[PDB]
Design a protein around this ligand. Sequence first.
Ligand SMILES: Cc1cc2nc3c(=O)[nH]c(=O)nc-3n(C[C@H](O)[C@H](O)[C@H](O)COP(=O)(O)O)c2cc1C
Ligand SMILES: Cc1cc2nc3c(=O)[nH]c(=O)nc-3n(C[C@H](O)[C@H](O)[C@H](O)COP(=O)(O)O)c2cc1C
Lengths: 172, 175
Amino acid sequence: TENPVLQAIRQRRSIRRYTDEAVSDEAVRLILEAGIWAPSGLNNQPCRFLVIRADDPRCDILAAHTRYGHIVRGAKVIILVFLDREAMYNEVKDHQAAGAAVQNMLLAAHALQLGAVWLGEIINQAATLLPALALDPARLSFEAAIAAGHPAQNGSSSRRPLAELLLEEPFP
Amino acid sequence: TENPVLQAIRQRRSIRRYTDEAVSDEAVRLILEAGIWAPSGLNNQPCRFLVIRADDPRCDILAAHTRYGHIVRGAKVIILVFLDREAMYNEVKDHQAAGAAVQNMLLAAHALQLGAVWLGEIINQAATLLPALALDPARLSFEAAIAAGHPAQNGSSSRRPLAELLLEEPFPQPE
Ligand SMILES: Cc1cc2nc3c(=O)[nH]c(=O)nc-3n(C[C@H](O)[C@H](O)[C@H](O)COP(=O)(O)O)c2cc1C
Ligand SMILES: Cc1cc2nc3c(=O)[nH]c(=O)nc-3n(C[C@H](O)[C@H](O)[C@H](O)COP(=O)(O)O)c2cc1C
C-alpha cells in the first residue's frame, strides 16, 4: 500500500518555474488553512500571513529584495510568513513552528497539484524590505516567502541515506 | 472532504497517551524517511536523529530531564532531533528546517495510524541531558523529541480563525 501522505512527503519538490495559469483563491485559502494548523509550543500560534499576487506592485518590491527575483516574478502567488513577536514564547521554538507552518503549506500546495518553493534568501533583507512593504519589523519577524503557481517543471533533488543522518544505527 | 494530505494536516493531533502495542521498525523507518525528506537551505541536510525505544535505559535519562516524564515513560519510541552544528548555515533557517522535519515526522506518524507529540520543553535541559546521553553539545543542537506509540486517546486543540492570522484580507469577501 502506498500511503498518499508519505508519498506527498517524499515527492514534494521545490518547484521554481510555473505555467501561466491562474491560481484560485480557494487554493490559496486551503494552503493558508494548512499553515495555521501547524503546531506551536504553547498553542501560541505566532505565525502571521500575507498573500501577494503577481499583479500586485509589491511583487516588484519583493523581487528587488532577493537574488531570486526571477522566481518571484514568475510566480502567480507569494505567501509571506512572519512571527508576531507579541505571540512568541521562545525564539528557537517559534522559528521551528514557522518551519512547520511552511512545511504544511508546501505539502498542501503539492496535494493541490501546485508547485511551490520555500524562499529564505529574501529574509536576509528584512530590515529594508519590511519598511518598503509598509510593515513593522519591530512587531514582525520575517520568516519565509513561499512562491507558487501551477508547475512547469517536475523538480529534482537528492538526500543522503538515512543511515548517515542517524547518530546511532537503530535497526538489526 | 476529499484530499487525504489536507485531512492529515488538519486532523493530526498531539497524542500523549499510548497503548502497549509495539511500534515496528518499519514504522520508525518510514517516519525517519519522512524527516530526512523535509527541505533545508542549500539542501545542506543539517538534521540528525537518535532513536530511543521504551526498553532502552536512556529513556530513564530522558525522563529525569523533563517535566513531561509521563509522556516519555509511556511512549513506545522517542525520536530525538538535532542539528549538526558543522552543517548549519543560518541558525534561524536551520531551526525552521528542523521544524519542517519534525512536522513531516508527525504527519508520517499520523498517516501510519500512530499517535505522536512534539516535545520541546525537554530541549531546555540540553546542556546536562546531551552529555548524559554521551552526546557533544559542541557538535549538536538539540531541537526536539518526538514521543510516539499506538494511540490511547484522541487529542483535541483549537486554532484562531485565518482572518485573525492574516495581515491583510486577500479575498474579495473579507474572512
Ligand atoms: C530555510 C530554507 C530556505 C530556502 N531558500 C531558498 C531560496 O531562497 N531559493 C531557492 O531557490 N530555494 C530555497 N530553498 C529550497 C531548497 O533549496 C530546497 O528545499 C532544497 O534544495 C531541497 O530541494 P527540494 O525542496 O526539492 O527537496 C530553501 C529551503 C529552506 C528550508
Ligand atoms: C516547539 C514545540 C514544542 C512543544 N513542546 C511540547 C511539550 O514539551 N509538551 C507537550 O505536551 N506538548 C508540546 N508541544 C505540543 C503543543 O502543545 C501542541 O502542538 C499544541 O498545543 C497544539 O496542539 P495539536 O498538536 O494537537 O494541534 C510542542 C509543540 C511545538 C511546536
